[PDB]
Amino acid sequence: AVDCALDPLSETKCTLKSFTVEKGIYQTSNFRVQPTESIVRFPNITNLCPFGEVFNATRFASVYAWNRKRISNCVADYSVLYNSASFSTFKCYGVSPTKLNDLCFTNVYADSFVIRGDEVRQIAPGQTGKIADYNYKLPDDFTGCVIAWNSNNLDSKVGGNYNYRYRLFRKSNLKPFERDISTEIYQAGSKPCNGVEGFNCYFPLQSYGFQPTNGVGYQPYRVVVLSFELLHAPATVCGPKKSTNLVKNKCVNFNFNGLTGTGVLTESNKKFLPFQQFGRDIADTTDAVRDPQTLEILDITPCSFGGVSVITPGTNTSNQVAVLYQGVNCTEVPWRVYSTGSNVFQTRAGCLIGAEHVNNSYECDIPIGAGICASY
């Protein structure tokens, strides 16, 4: 057998799937600088914004006249929101409820209304229904979350709570995220109604049978939706994640306002204008960032790495190896039995472990890269 996680001679065997590795250079894998000293950065602003009063609000608006709000400049703790079982439905479609606690957005939208218990499934992406098509329409890319919970003891009256109304007939559909207030007559035939009375002319105001004796699947469930945006503004509505101190010119991992990435940060001679929030250069790779608090420009390159290659001259000839790291200045490597040793050499294509430069000149055989080549 062969261990494929031990010494580089054995790892060459594991890739070529043989016990007899011929002389030369093979590709083993890729290497990376693992990050340490994890850094996480948010803006200064740290007050809470009351989503709770919106969650725990006694009277909502209608299904076709849903109330819409924009929230900014807060931190919201989704952990106290996540574990709570007071909502009958808590489902997030475009996102996972457990991972909201890490990312920070801005311009969060919440629309609330009251609906029957069976229709709490209707508020979902790709769903058709009465209120899914005539009172509130949802896009196919509707990322976010929705919350419903029963309110039969409160939103149902013994005389019949008819205050929760909805439109029954309309000429056409409704666009997603629009509100109508015009309570107008419906033409159901060929006679133009002009809003008085009579057949093929119906009043869209019509009621529900809300009663406190009514059980599950028809109770008034208060439904609140949670909609988010992706990367239009400097993010203000953060999650329950704190901050730390930032370090430069060392391969770290960073959470800059919900933007997760890896690399070495250093001081940038570029010129951010004050309207700028962050940077990118080519094809959606964030090339420079100004931090959310000290408001100074850093630039990001993901920390230097490449492939690892093994120089072994054949398992019949010897057992000693050399290891190439592709394209790294061989100082930012943190194999600790080899890395500290007799000689470690640095190439224009990276660095060499277990090998010493000689002044010689040979008709070389095992290529390394950058014009240097290795041999036993």
């Epitope: 019949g160 008819y162 007939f169 159901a188 035939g189 093929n200 119906y202 105001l205 019509q206 049978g209």
Partner: antibody
Framework: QVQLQQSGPGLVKPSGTLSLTCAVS?????????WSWVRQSPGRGLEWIGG???????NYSPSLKSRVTMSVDQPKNQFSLHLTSVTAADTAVYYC?????????WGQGTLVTVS | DIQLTQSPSSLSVSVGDRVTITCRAS??????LAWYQQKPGKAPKLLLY???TLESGVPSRFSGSGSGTDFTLTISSLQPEDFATYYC????????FGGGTKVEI
């Protein structure tokens, strides 16, 4: 729900009369609801007869315009049907139902079986 | 007046497959049609209406399409207790319930 409860006796003799009633629970009559009735004859299926408005205006089908008159009781919260000269072709389950064009909520229906 | 010519009426198809109920009218009832479910010995129960808007409590396997003199009520998966008479009813004028398709086992 708009529950519509039908009440009274059901067995009748041939060439007799049916005086049927539909009590309304859960919907205001003072609204745009047309409080209507649907019978179920064999061969004809369900057939739209007509409905009433709470002010008294009415619209019927021409096959059952000549025999049906209906009235409204707003504080009693009901609506009725009157069939004059119930024939053997009226062997049908008569369903009171709330209408605004569509019939979103129904009564359960009484079959008229003359015996 | 606008009359309703049904198509499904009676049919004997097996479980879970597609059931068509075609209701054809004389004139344009493009937005004006309802679609009920009546078990024999029970009350009718409205499935769809008002240009494919579904009634609260009705599942989403039932879909509506069509406009004018071509309409449909579709059951994506038939059940044994789905033995019911499925009427079309327009409201472009004085209404009329269709013949009703008694979908049989």
């Amino acid at each position: 729900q708009v529950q519509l409860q039908q009440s009274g006796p059901g067995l009748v003799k041939p060439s007799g009369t049916l005086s049927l009633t539909c009590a309304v629970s859960g919907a205001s009559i003072s609204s745009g609801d047309w409080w209507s009735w649907v019978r179920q004859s064999p061969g004809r299926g369900l057939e739209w007869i007509g409905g009433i408005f709470h002010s008294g205006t009415t619209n019927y089908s021409p096959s059952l315009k000549s025999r049906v008159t209906m009235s409204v009781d707003q504080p009693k919260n009901q609506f009725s049907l009157h069939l004059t000269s119930v024939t053997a072709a009226d062997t049908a389950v008569y369903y009171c139902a709330r209408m605004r064009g569509i019939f979103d909520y129904w009564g359960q229906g009484t079959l008229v079986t003359v015996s | 007046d606008i009359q309703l010519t049904q198509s499904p009426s009676s049919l004997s198809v097996s479980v879970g497959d597609r059931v068509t109920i075609t209701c054809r009218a004389s004139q344009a009832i493009s937005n004006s049609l309802a679609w009920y479910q009546q078990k024999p010995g029970k009350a009718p129960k409205l499935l769809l209406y008002a240009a494919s808007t579904l009634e609260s409590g009705v599942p989403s396997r039932f879909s509506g399409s069509g406009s004018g003199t071509d309409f449909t009520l579709t059951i994506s998966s038939l059940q044994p207790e789905d033995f019911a008479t499925y009427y079309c009813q327009h409201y472009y004028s004085t209404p009329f319930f269709g013949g009703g398709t008694k979908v049989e086992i």
